[PDB]
Coordinates of C-alpha atoms and ligand atoms in Angstrom, one line a residue:
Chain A
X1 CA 139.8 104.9 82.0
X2 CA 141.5 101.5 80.8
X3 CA 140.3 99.2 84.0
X4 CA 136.5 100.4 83.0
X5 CA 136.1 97.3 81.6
X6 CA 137.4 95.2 84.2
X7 CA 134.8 93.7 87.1
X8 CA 135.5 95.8 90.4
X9 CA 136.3 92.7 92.3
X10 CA 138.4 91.5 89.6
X11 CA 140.7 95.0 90.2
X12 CA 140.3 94.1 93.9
X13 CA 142.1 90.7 93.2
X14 CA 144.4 91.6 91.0
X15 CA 145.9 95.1 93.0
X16 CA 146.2 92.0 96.3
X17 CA 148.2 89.8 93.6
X18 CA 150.4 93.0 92.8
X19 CA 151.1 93.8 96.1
X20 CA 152.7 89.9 96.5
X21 CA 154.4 90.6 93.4
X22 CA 155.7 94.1 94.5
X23 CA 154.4 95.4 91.2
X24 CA 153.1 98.6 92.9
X25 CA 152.5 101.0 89.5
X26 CA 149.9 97.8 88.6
X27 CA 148.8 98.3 91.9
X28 CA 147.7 101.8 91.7
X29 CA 146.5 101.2 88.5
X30 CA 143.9 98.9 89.9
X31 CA 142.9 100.2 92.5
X32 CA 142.4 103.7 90.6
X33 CA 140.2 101.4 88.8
X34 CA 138.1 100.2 91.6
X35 CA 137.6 103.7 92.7
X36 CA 136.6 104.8 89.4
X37 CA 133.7 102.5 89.8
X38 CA 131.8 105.2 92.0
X39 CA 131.1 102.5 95.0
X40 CA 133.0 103.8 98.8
X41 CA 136.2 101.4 99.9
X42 CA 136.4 99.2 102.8
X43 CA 139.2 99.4 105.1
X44 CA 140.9 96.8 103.4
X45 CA 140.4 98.7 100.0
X46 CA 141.3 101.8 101.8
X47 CA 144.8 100.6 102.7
X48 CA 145.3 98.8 99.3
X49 CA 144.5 102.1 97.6
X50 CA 147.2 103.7 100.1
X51 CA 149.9 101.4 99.9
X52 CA 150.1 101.3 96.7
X53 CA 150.4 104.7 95.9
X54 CA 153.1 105.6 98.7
X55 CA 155.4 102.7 97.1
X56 CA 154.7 104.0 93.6
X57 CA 155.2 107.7 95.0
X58 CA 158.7 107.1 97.5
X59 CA 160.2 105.6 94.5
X60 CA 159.7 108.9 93.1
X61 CA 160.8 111.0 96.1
X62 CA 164.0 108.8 96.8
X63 CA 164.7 109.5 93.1
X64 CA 164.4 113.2 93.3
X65 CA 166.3 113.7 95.9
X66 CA 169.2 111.7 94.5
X67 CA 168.7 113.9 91.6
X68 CA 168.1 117.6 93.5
X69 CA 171.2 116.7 95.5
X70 CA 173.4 116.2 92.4
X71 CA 172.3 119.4 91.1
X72 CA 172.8 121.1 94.3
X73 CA 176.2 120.4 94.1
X74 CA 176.6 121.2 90.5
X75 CA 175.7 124.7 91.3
X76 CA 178.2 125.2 94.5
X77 CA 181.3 123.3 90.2
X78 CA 182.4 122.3 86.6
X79 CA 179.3 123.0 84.7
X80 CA 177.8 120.2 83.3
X81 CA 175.1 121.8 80.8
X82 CA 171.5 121.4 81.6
X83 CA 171.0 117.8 81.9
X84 CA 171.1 117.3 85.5
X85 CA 168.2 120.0 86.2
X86 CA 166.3 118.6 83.0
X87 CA 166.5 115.2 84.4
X88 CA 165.6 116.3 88.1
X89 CA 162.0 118.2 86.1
X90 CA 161.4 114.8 84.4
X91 CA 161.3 113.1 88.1
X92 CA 159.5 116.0 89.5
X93 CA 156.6 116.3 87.0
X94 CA 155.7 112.4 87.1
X95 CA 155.7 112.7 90.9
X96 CA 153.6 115.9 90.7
X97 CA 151.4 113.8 87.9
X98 CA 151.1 111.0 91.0
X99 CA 150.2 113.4 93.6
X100 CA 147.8 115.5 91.4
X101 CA 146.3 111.8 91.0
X102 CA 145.6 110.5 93.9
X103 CA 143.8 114.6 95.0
X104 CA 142.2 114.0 92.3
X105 CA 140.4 110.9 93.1
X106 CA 139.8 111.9 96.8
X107 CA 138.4 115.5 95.0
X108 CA 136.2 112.9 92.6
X109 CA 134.7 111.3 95.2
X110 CA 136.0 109.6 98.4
X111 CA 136.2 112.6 100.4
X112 CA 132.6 113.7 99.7
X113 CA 131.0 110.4 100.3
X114 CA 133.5 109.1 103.7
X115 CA 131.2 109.9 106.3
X116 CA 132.4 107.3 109.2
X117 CA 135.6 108.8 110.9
X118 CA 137.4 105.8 110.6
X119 CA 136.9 106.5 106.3
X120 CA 137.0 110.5 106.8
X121 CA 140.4 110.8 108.7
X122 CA 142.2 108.1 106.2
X123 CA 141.2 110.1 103.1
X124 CA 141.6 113.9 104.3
X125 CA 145.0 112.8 106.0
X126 CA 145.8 110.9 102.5
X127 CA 144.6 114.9 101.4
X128 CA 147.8 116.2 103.4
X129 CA 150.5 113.9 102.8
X130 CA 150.2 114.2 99.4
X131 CA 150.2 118.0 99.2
X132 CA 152.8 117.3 101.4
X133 CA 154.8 115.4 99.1
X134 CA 153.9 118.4 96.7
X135 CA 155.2 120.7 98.8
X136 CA 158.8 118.9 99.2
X137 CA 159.6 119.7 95.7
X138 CA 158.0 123.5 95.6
X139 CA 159.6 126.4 95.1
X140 CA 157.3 128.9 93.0
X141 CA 154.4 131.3 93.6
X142 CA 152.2 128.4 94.7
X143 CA 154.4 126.7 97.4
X144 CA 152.6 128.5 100.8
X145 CA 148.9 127.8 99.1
X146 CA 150.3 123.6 98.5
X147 CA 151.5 124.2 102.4
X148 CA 148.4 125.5 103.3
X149 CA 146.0 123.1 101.4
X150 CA 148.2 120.2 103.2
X151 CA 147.9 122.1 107.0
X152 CA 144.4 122.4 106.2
X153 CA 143.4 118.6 105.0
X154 CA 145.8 117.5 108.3
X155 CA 143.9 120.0 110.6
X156 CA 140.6 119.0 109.4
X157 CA 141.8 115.1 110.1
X158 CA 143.0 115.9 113.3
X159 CA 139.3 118.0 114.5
X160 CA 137.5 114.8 113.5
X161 CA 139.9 112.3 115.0
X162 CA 139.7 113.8 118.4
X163 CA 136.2 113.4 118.7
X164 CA 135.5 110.3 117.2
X165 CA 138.4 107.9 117.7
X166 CA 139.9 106.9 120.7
X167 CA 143.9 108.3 121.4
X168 CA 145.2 104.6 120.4
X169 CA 143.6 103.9 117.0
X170 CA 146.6 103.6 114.4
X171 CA 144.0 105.8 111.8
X172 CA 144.6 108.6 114.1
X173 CA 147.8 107.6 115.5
X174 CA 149.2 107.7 112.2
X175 CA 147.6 111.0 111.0
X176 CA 149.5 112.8 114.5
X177 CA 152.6 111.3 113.4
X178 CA 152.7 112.5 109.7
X179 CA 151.4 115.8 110.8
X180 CA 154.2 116.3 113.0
X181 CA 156.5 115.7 110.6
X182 CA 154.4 118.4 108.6
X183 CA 155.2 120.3 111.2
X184 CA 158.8 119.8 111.9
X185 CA 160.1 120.2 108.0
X186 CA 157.4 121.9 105.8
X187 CA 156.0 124.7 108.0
X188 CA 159.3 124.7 110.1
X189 CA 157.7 124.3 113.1
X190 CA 159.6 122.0 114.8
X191 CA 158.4 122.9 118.3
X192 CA 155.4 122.1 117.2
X193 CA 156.1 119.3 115.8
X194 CA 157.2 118.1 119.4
X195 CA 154.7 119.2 121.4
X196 CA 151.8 117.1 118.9
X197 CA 154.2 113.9 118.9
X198 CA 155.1 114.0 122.7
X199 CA 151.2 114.3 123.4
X200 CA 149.9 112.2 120.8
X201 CA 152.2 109.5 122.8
X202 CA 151.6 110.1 126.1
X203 CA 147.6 109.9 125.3
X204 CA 148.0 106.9 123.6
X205 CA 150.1 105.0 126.2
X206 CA 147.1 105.9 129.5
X207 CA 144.9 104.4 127.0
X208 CA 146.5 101.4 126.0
X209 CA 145.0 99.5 128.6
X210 CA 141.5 99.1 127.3
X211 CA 143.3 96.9 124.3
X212 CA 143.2 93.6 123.3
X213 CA 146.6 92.0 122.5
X214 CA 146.1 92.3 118.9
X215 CA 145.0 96.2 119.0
X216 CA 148.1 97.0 121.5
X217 CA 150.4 95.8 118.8
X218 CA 149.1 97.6 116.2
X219 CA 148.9 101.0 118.3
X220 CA 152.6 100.3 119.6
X221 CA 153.6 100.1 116.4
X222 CA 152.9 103.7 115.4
X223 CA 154.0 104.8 118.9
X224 CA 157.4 103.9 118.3
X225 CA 157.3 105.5 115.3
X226 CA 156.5 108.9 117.6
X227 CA 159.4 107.9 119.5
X228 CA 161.7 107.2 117.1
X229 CA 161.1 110.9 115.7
X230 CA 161.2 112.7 119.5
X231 CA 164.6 111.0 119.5
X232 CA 165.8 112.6 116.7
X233 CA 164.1 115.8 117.2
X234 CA 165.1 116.3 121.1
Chain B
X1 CA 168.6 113.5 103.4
X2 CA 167.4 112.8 106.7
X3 CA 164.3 111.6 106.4
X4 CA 162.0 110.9 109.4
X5 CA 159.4 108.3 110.3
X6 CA 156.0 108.7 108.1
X7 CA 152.8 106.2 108.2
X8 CA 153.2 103.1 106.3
X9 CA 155.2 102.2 103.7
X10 CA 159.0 103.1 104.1
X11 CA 159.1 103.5 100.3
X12 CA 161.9 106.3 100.1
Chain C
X1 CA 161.9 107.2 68.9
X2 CA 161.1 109.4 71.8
X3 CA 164.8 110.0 72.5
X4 CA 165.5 111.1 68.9
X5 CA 166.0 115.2 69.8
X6 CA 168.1 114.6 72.6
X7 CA 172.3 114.6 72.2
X8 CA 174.3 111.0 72.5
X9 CA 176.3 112.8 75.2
X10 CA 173.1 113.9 77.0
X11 CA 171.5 110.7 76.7
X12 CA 174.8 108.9 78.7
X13 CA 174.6 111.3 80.8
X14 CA 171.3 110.8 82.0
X15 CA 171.5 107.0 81.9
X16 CA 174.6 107.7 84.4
X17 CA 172.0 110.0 86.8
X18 CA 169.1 107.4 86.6
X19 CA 171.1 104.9 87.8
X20 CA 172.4 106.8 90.7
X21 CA 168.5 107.2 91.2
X22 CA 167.6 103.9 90.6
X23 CA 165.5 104.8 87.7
X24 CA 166.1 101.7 85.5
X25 CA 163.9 101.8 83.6
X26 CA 164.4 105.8 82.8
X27 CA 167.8 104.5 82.4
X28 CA 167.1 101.8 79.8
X29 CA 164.9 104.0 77.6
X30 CA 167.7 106.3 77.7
X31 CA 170.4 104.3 76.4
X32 CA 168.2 102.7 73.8
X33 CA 167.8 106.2 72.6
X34 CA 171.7 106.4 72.6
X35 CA 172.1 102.6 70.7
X36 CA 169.8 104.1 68.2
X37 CA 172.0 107.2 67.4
X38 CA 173.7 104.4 65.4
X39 CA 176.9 104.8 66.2
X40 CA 179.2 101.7 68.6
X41 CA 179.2 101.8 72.2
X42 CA 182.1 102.2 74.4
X43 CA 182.5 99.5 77.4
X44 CA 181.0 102.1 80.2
X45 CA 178.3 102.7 77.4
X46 CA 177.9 98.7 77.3
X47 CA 178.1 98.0 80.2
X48 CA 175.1 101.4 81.1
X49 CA 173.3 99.3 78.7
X50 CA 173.0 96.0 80.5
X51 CA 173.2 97.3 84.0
X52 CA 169.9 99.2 82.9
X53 CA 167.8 96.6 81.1
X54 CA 169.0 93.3 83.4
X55 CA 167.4 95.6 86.3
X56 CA 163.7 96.0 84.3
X57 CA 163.8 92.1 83.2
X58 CA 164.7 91.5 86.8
X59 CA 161.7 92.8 88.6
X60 CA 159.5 91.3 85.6
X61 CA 161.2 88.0 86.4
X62 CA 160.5 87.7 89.7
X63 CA 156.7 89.0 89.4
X64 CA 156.3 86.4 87.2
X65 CA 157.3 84.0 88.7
X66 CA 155.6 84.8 92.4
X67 CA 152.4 85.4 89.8
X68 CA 153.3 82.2 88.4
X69 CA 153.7 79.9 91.8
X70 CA 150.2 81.3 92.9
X71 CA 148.4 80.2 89.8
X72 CA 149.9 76.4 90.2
X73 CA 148.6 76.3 93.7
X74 CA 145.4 77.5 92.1
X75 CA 145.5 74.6 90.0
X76 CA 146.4 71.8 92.4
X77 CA 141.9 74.4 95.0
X78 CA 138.9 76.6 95.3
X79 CA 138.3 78.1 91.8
X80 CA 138.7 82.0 91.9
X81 CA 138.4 82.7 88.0
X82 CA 140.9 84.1 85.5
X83 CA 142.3 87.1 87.2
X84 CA 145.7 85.4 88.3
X85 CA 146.4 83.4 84.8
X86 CA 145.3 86.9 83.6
X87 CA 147.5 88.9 85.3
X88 CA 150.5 86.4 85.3
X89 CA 149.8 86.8 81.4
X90 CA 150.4 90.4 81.6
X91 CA 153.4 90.6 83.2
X92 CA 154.9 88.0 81.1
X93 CA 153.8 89.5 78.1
X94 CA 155.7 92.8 79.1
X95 CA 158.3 90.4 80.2
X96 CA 158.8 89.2 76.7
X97 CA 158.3 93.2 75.3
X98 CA 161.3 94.0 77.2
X99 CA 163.4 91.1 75.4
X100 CA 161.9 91.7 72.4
X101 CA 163.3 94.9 72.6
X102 CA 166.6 94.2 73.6
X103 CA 167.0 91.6 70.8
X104 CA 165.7 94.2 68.6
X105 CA 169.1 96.6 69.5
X106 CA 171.3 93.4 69.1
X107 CA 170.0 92.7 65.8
X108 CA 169.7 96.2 64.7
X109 CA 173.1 97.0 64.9
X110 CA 174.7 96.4 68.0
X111 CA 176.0 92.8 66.6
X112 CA 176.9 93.4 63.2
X113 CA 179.3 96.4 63.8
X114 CA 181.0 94.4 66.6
X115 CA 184.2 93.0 65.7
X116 CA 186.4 92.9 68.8
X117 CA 186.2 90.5 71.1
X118 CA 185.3 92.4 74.1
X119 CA 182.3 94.0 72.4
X120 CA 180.9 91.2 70.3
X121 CA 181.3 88.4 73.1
X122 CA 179.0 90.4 75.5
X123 CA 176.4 91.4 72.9
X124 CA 176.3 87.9 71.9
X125 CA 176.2 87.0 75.9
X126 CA 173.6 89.3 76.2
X127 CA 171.3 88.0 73.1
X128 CA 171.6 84.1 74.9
X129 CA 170.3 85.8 78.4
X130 CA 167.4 87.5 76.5
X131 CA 166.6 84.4 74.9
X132 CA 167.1 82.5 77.9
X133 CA 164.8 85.1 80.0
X134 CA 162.2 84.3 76.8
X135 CA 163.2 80.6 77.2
X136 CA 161.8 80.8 81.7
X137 CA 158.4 81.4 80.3
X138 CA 157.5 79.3 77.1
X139 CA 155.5 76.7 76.9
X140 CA 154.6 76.5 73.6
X141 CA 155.2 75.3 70.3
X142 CA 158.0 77.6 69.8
X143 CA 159.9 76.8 73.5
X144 CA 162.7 74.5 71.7
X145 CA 163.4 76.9 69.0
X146 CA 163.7 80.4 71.8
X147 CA 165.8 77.2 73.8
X148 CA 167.9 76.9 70.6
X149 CA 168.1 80.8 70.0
X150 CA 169.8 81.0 73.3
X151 CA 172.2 77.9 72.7
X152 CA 173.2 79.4 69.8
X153 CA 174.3 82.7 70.7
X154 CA 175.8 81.4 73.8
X155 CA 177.7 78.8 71.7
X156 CA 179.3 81.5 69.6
X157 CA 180.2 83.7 72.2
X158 CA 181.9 80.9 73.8
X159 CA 184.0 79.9 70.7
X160 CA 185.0 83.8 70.7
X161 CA 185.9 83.9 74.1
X162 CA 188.1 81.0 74.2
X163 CA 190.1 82.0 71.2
X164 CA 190.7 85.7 71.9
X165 CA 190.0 86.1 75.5
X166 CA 192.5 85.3 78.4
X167 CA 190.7 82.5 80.9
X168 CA 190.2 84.9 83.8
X169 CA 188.8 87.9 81.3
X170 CA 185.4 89.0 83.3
X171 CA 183.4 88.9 79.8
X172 CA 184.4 85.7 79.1
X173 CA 183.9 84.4 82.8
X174 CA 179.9 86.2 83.1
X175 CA 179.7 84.2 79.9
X176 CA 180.7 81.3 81.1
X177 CA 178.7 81.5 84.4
X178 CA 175.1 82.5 82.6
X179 CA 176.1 79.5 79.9
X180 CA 176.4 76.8 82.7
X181 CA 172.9 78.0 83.9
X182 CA 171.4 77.7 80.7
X183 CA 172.5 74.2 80.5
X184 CA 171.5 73.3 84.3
X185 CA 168.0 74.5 84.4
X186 CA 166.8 75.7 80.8
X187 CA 168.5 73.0 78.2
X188 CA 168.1 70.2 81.2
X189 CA 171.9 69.1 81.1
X190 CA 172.9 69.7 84.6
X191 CA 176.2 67.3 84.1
X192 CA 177.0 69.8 81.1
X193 CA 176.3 72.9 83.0
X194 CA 178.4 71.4 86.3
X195 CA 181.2 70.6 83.7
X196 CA 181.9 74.1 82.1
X197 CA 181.5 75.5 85.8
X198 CA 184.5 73.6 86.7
X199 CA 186.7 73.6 83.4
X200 CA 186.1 77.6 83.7
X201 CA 186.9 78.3 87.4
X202 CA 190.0 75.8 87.0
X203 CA 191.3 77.5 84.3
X204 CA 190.9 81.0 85.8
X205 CA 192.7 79.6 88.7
X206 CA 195.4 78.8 86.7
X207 CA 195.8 82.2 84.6
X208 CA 195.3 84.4 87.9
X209 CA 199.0 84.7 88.1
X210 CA 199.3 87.2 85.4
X211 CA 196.6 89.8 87.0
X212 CA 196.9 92.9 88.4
X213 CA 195.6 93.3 92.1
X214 CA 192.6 95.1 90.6
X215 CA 192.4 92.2 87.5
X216 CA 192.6 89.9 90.3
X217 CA 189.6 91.2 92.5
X218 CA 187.5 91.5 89.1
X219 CA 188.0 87.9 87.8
X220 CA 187.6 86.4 91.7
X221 CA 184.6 87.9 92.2
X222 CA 183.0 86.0 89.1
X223 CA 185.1 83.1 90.0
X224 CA 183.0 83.0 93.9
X225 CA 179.8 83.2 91.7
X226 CA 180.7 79.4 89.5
X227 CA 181.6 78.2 93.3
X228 CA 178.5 79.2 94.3
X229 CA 176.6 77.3 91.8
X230 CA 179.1 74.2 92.0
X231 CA 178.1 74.1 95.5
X232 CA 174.2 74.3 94.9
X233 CA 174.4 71.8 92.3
X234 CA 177.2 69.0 93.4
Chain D
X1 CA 162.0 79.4 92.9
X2 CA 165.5 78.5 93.8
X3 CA 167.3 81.3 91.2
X4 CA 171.1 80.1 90.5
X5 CA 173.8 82.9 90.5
X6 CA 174.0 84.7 86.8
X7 CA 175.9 87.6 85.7
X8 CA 175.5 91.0 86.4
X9 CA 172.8 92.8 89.0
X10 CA 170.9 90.3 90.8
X11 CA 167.3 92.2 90.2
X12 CA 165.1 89.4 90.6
Ligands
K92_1 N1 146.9 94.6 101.8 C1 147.3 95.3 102.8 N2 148.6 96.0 102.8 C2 146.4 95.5 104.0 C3 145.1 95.0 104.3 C4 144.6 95.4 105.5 C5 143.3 95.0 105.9 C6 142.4 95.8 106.5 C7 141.1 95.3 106.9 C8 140.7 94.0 106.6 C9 141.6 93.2 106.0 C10 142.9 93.6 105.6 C11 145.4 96.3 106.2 C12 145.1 96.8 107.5 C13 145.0 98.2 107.8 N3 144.7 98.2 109.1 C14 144.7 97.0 109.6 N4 144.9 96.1 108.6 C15 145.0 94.6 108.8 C16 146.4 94.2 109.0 N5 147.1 94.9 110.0 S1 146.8 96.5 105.3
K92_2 N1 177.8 102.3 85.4 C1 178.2 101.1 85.5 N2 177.3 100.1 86.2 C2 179.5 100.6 85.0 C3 180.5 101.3 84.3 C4 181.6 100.5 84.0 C5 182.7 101.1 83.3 C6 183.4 100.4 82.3 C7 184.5 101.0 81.6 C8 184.9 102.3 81.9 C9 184.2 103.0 82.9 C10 183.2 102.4 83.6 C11 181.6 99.2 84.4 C12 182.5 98.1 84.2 C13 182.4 97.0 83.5 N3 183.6 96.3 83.6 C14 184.4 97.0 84.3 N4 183.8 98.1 84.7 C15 184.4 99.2 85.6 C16 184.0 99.0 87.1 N5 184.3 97.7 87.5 S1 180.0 98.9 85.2
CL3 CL1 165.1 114.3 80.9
CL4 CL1 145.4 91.8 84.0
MG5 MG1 159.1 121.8 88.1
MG6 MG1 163.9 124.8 123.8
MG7 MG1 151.7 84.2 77.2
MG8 MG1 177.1 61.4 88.9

């Protein structure tokens, strides 16, 4: 809507200059923008369009659960009136509005035009963390469907990743790792959330020697990520 | 809460 | 305007939960919703105030000013067009909205009800920092009169201060710090702004004898902040 | 920029 009138490259620029200046809502905002303009994303577009939603949208997390926390305790005391849940809505509908954004623009039309795995994976598994994000703050009739729709964009990721990519590349490494915690906290599966994280590392370390040093770093990255979790987890 | 390791951005 | 239904009480309340979420600027909008109730504002209710909109000018601040250092360098190369001055003239623009605004609450009616020291020094304070923030980014043909705005404001609330506020008062030493800036880096009178840093932290010295241990911690920790500029600029 | 110490939260 209001970037039409700015020059796709221009919204390319100016979402790299937000990034320096950690302005991340004016980051979204552009890079919305660029998408809007109907033409696929590089890689580099790709992860603009990502990090820049996932600041704008763990803002909004790390605000709601201040906020569910408080209320937690207020019911579970003296009773406080309705302010606290009020307040904790207003946080949870703009980071709905966020997440029904970003499915909206991978509905409308990355998904349907990413046909290289490398663009596929990165969009459907952008798909499940944000229903995943959805589903932290469900509790109605609709929270195993959000589940579902998240398991399902993640599953989907996962089918293409193992055929096309190799067990190192941080696309696919990345996908295992957020799908295991998918696993461990929203379909409370934690033994399965184990199992995917221990293999996912194992596969990628008897593959790590066909790297250069550059790619190794990137892959190790993520792997210790893996780790990290297992530690906690085991 | 604990929160545990996610792609990207540790925004949260 | 779009906090006129909801309570005074509920308004405070909520400025209270968004800073515990680090919502400033949820927290700003709400306690200009509470200014505009029309009635005075206790010190907590103050104090919610600042805390709220120094946080929003903050992060506009320091985008500008990383917008700002990249658009010098591109001066000063290779010629990339007009999306940085663009951009840096977006954030500065909402830069000067949010000061705009705040000036707005001083001037309508936060100033003119306040009559005791405590209250009128820091809106006063608080009208020479929004005018200084104004002053960071002019360049025009009105930068010596926002300059003289900010002298102004300061210069009253320093005249208030020393005749009805003890040397080591916390008001009166924030004052004194932001004032001694001012001078160093916006009115280009370092030797004025290294002057007042010393006459205030010597005089605090010398009243820190009557405090409390809690005074005492309060007034130091202002105190550590002059040092820290004496020591930068001496 | 080299940002002297001011008043209040240091947000920038
Ligand atoms: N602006 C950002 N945050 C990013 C930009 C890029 C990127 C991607 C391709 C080409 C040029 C830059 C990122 C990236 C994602 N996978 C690897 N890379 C590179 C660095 N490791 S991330
Ligand atoms: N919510 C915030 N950020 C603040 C609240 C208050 C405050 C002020 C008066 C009564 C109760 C609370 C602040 C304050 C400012 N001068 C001293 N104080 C107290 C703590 N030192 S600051
Ligand atoms: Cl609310
Ligand atoms: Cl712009
Ligand atoms: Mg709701
Ligand atoms: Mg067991
Ligand atoms: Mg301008
Ligand atoms: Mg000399």
């Amino acid at each position: 809507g209001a970037m039409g009138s700015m020059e796709r490259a221009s919204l390319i620029q100016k979402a790299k200059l937000a990034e320096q200046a950690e302005r991340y809502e004016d980051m979204a905002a552009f890079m919305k923008g660029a998408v809007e303009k109907g033409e696929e994303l590089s890689c580099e577009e790709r992860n603009l369009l990502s990090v820049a939603y996932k600041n704008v949208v763990g803002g909004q997390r790390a605000a709601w659960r201040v906020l569910s926390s408080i209320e937690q305790k207020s019911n579970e005391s003296e009773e406080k009136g309705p302010e606290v849940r009020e307040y904790r809505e207003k946080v949870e509908t703009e980071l709905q509005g966020v997440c029904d954004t970003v499915l909206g623009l991978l509905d409308s039309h990355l998904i349907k035009e990413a046909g290289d795995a490398e663009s596929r994976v990165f969009y459907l598994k952008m798909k499940g963390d944000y229903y995943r994000y959805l589903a932290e703050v469900a509790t109605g009739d609709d929270k195993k469907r959000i589940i579902d729709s998240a398991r399902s964009a993640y599953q989907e990721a996962m089918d293409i990743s193992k055929k096309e990519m190799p067990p190192t590349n941080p696309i696919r490494l990345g996908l295992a790792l957020n799908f295991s915690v998918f696993h461990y906290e929203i379909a409370n599966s934690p033994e399965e959330a184990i199992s995917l994280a221990k293999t996912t590392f194992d596969e990628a370390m008897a593959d790590l020697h066909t790297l250069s040093e550059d790619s190794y770093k990137d892959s190790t990255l993520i792997m210790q990520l893996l780790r990290d979790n297992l530690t906690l987890w085991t | 809460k604990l929160m545990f390791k996610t792609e990207g951005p540790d925004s949260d």
